[PDB]
């Protein structure tokens, strides 16, 4: 599985597009409410301020968090996930495919474990 850092980076990105979807939905409801506000029933007038404020605050902080994600693309070059060289796997495929084969021989060698 992928190392820790990438998992929360993808979680944050997923939160970003879910917030964008919520912003689009709230745009839909505010467009809906403005229609009847123009039709001239004043009951839903208080809800308009709340919808506008929530729409703007959803638009702002989403873009703000996407700013942090692009800073993290620039800043994580060779960083947090530090290098490692303990045999490199493109070569070391020869080594796991050594080990497991001998393991099979052991299973073949002992007739009491073949059950």
């Amino acid at each position: 599985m992928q190392p820790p850092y990438i998992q929360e980076r993808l979680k944050s990105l997923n939160d970003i597009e879910t917030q964008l979807c919520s912003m689009l939905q709230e745009a839909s409801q505010v467009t809906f409410i403005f229609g009847e506000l123009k039709r001239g029933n004043e009951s839903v007038k208080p809800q308009f301020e709340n919808h506008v404020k929530q729409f703007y605050e959803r638009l702002d902080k989403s873009t703000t968090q996407l700013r942090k994600e692009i800073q993290l693309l620039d800043e994580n070059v060779g960083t947090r996930l530090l290098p490692i060289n303990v045999n490199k796997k493109a070569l070391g495929q020869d080594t796991e495919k050594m080990e497991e084969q001998l393991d099979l021989l052991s299973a073949i060698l002992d007739p009491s474990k073949s059950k």
């Binding site: 070569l91 020869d94 495919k97 050594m98 084969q101 001998l102 099979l104 021989l105 073949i108």
Partner: protein, 129 residues
């Protein structure tokens, strides 16, 4: 593929290739057939065949490790495998089997011509590294 290229040089000792997927090895008392087949009662020698497959895979892995070590050792050396030297897969198994056969034959010869003729002879068997 490696088995094919290796056994193409063992015709003179009783090894033949039947088709693109079959190779046959003959011994004065035994026959071995190696086949590449598409998917489309426990016998005595089933474990023998499984062991043969296992050591063939091990020898291929050893060949790969030798290649990687030679490559890392020096850059100039062109990595072109020699069939007479590098490819050693059927050679060890065939050598072990035929050496055992010849050891049995010489044991029989010595017993017939020395042990049965000259009593009291003492025989000691050793291996030298």
């Amino acid at each position: 593929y490696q088995i094919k290229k290796e056994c193409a040089l063992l015709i003179s000792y009783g090894v033949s290739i039947e088709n693109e997927n079959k190779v046959i090895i003959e011994l004065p008392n035994e026959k071995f057939e190696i086949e590449l087949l598409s998917l489309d009662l426990p016998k005595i020698n089933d474990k023998r065949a499984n062991l043969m497959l296992v050591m063939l895979r091990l020898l291929l892995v050893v060949i790969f490790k030798k290649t990687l070590r030679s490559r890392i050792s020096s850059p100039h050396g062109l990595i072109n495998l020699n069939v007479d030297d590098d490819i050693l897969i059927i050679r060890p198994i065939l050598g072990k089997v035929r050496f055992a056969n010849y050891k049995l034959l010489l044991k029989k010869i010595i017993k017939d011509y020395v042990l049965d003729i000259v009593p009291g002879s003492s025989i000691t068997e050793t291996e030298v590294e």
